[PDB]
Structure 1
């Protein structure tokens, strides 16, 4: 410390410049799509705008679309459902946009720089929303993993384009599933792991194994993942130890980074208010996301016979990536009880084409929390040794000793408020 103050201040400015680009670009696209103040603050509109940018910068998929065009869709144009309110009622119209025009607007909003950080930030926000809304046991069962480890699927929907930043936020289950797919492909195809492309696959297999090893904490888990990496031709045996490693993560949890990626509508509103994130700085693990959400007002489209509070809770959890967190700690921070997924009277935020966009009304999302906490990249505290470690482990050991929850008025996190604690499983 006393030397990392400068480093911390430098990092804050760089993140603020990314958020400023996200906000500046959203403002331009809202002004260029001709969206009113209400429609601009709709979460459905923000997702559509975000998805347009992400697809506009997908070089690989765009190339494949050019080479092998789809039916009725030219590969040079993107878009999505844009919801406009005129005369009280809501209607949806598909907007088509050149991917190059979207790219120019995004680049100009970032002072002519690619700014791949902003795109990955939006990608993490979508993954957080998907994790809190949809549970992918089909992929777990399809790959041969037990569907009970749904707590390790953090960031399973993130595309491979989010490197480094994306891998930091994704969980052990997603990393294992990626490796298991590689093993399944290698077992099926004998030419896998061989030739020039096999060498490229090998380096990818090694690198993704290395990040999985760094995700673990106990020395035993790192050594076993080290063994799995050394296998030149991994097969069923490496299949099993990865499954065992995944099961051990439920007790000896890994270190998964948690960042609060807000929807682009919140950033656009803040930038229009004159907030200079570059000057004041930003942070995805501190109070800045919480203080932004407190002063931010966002609307959503509510399907008939749906509780706005439950939808607002879903967005609140996705914003802070609390999908797999303890319900008691999530409830304590928010101030209103967080209900498990099975008891939520709501469907996903995104509205499908086959849905009659005429009985849909809009509601204000309550994305405000009574308390605020710091997001953690840490967990808590051969093979027989691994089983021995989790036998000693009990579901009562106290973690994060002395670390609590602060007040929105306590911007320096000086006085923690330790909670004292009936379910605790969102997907249970």
Structure 2
């Protein structure tokens, strides 16, 4: 049944929106200031810093960074008669812990935490990707496309584990392998047993993510090495460059700004009654009547900022630019010529130059975002023997194979997925590559 899942997610987002309502009540912010992305961003890093129970335990025994008992950051942006000012207001974790507890009807609301942390991962992937660490592990910078969910820490659950990319898992496992190579860390002690356990958990997440049998079997055989040394490093690099084309079935969770939920809940649109979905039309139509204000530099233009915000909201920064333009109805500029900077504001930037303006989120069309792979795969002793079939499959692969047969782009006016329209692009080589 799907009604129970819809009711659960509706209750969750209703609690999130009511928490947004109460923070707006408590912060004494104006109507416009309640529609600012920066305030929600800072509040949600406060959120993660309050439920990072592992880091809370680590920092209680580590009183450093000066004035850091329970309070971090808090750069609240406020309006005086047109101008803007930031105040470093410090909030302790514990009261916000109870305000959450009262916001979800006595529950912890860890799932909502997973969705907010994933949405932060989505915005991070949209804005900046780290070839720095990618080459710190020595892997080439030609796989920036598999850094989805890279900023997500381990503390997230299965729902968080679903959206992390294959390359993110590759980076996380190589970190553990290099740590176990630097020092003899795999002893029979509890630490070795626990890192072992985390290793097979991440590995069966990996093998669940893939679709073709060959890569699943080679991941199975990579496990057979009780002592991860150097050979497994190139083995899993080969796994990664095979997943470049033999991509894993990774989900795309559609989370939206902290405000969008709050504005919807404030207006009285109860999500429990009519039901809510995370993959269907829902996050599209909530943005059809949503107003969002944002802060922009004197050199930054808002036109690219709105498109980057739509990237962050729908996690389409790793998709083809042509398709995103089709759903937008307007051309989407690649990151090569974006005359904009990161959404977050640096701690040293002055305030006389900063200017607030609206963001456009309206899209002409809507589409389903399933956790499936291209139809091209369906059309098609050690690790090297399977690398042979990897190579022959790569040779069989073509840049022409059309995927996603039987599905299409839909119009906004339809609600039950009745009749789509088939898109068709013949616009030469505009560039289907967000980076470069």
TM-score range, shorter chain: over 0.9
**By how many angstroms is 1:78 displaced?**
3.6
**By how many angstroms is 1:79 displaced?**
4.4
2:10 corresponds to which residue?
16
**By how many angstroms is 1:320 displaced?**
0.6
Q: Which moved more, 1:73-82 or 1:270-279?
A: 73-82
Deviation string for 1:133-163 (max 9, x for gaps)?
0021001000121111011110001121112
2:50 corresponds to which residue?
56
1:302–1:360: 8 Å Cα contact kept in structure 2? yes
Moved over 3 A (4+): none
1:286 corresponds to which residue?
280
**By how many angstroms is 1:382 displaced?**
1.5
| 1:315 has 2:323 as partner | no
CA distance in 2, matches of 1:79, 1:23: 23
**By how many angstroms is 1:191 displaced?**
2.8
Secondary structure of 1:90 counterpart: strand
* Length, aligned pairs only: 422
1:402–1:418: 8 Å Cα contact kept in structure 2? no
| 1:425 has 2:433 as partner | yes
**By how many angstroms is 1:175 displaced?**
0.7
For structure 1, the 5+ residue unaligned runs are 1-6
Select 2:329's aligned residue among 322, 329, 335.
Answer: 335
1:27–1:268: 8 Å Cα contact kept in structure 2? yes
2:76–2:86: 8 Å Cα contact kept in structure 1? yes
**By how many angstroms is 1:194 displaced?**
3.7
Deviation string for 1:56-96 (max 9, x for gaps)?
11111111221111232233224411110111101111121
Deviation string for 1:242-272 (max 9, x for gaps)?
1001001111111110011101100000000
CA distance in 2, matches of 1:54, 1:213: 29
For structure 2, the 5+ residue unaligned runs are 375-384
2:129–2:144: 8 Å Cα contact kept in structure 1? yes
2:74–2:91: 8 Å Cα contact kept in structure 1? no
Deviation string for 1:299-319 (max 9, x for gaps)?
100011111010110110111
CA distance in 2, matches of 1:195, 1:323: 43
CA distance in 1, matches of 2:351, 2:372: 43
Cα–Cα, structure 1 residues 412 and 129, in superposed 2: closer, same or farther, change >3 Å? Answer: same
CA distance in 1, matches of 2:254, 2:359: 17
2:10–2:276: 8 Å Cα contact kept in structure 1? yes
Secondary structure of 1:148 counterpart: helix
Deviation string for 1:222-260 (max 9, x for gaps)?
011111122111111111111001001111111110011
TM-score normalised by structure 1 residue count: 0.97
Q: Which moved more, 1:25-34 or 1:75-84?
A: 75-84
1:193–1:202: 8 Å Cα contact kept in structure 2? no
1:56–1:78: 8 Å Cα contact kept in structure 2? no
**By how many angstroms is 1:357 displaced?**
1.5
1:186–1:193: 8 Å Cα contact kept in structure 2? no
**By how many angstroms is 1:414 displaced?**
1.2
CA distance in 1, matches of 2:307, 2:424: 22
Secondary structure of 1:282 counterpart: coil
1:185–1:192: 8 Å Cα contact kept in structure 2? no
Secondary structure of 1:419 counterpart: coil
CA distance in 2, matches of 1:266, 1:61: 29
Deviation string for 1:96-154 (max 9, x for gaps)?
11100111111111111001011111111111100010021001000121111011110
1:226 corresponds to which residue?
220
1:140–1:146: 8 Å Cα contact kept in structure 2? yes
Secondary structure of 1:85 counterpart: strand
Select 1:392's aligned residue among 373, 393, 396.
Answer: 396
Secondary structure of 2:424 counterpart: coil
2:114–2:160: 8 Å Cα contact kept in structure 1? yes
Secondary structure of 2:146 counterpart: coil
CA distance in 2, matches of 1:22, 1:101: 16
Secondary structure of 1:383 counterpart: helix
CA distance in 1, matches of 2:57, 2:265: 34
1:78–1:99: 8 Å Cα contact kept in structure 2? no
1:216–1:253: 8 Å Cα contact kept in structure 2? yes
Deviation string for 1:255-299 (max 9, x for gaps)?
110011101100000000101111122111110000011111011
Secondary structure of 1:323 counterpart: coil
CA distance in 1, matches of 2:149, 2:213: 25
CA distance in 2, matches of 1:203, 1:337: 47
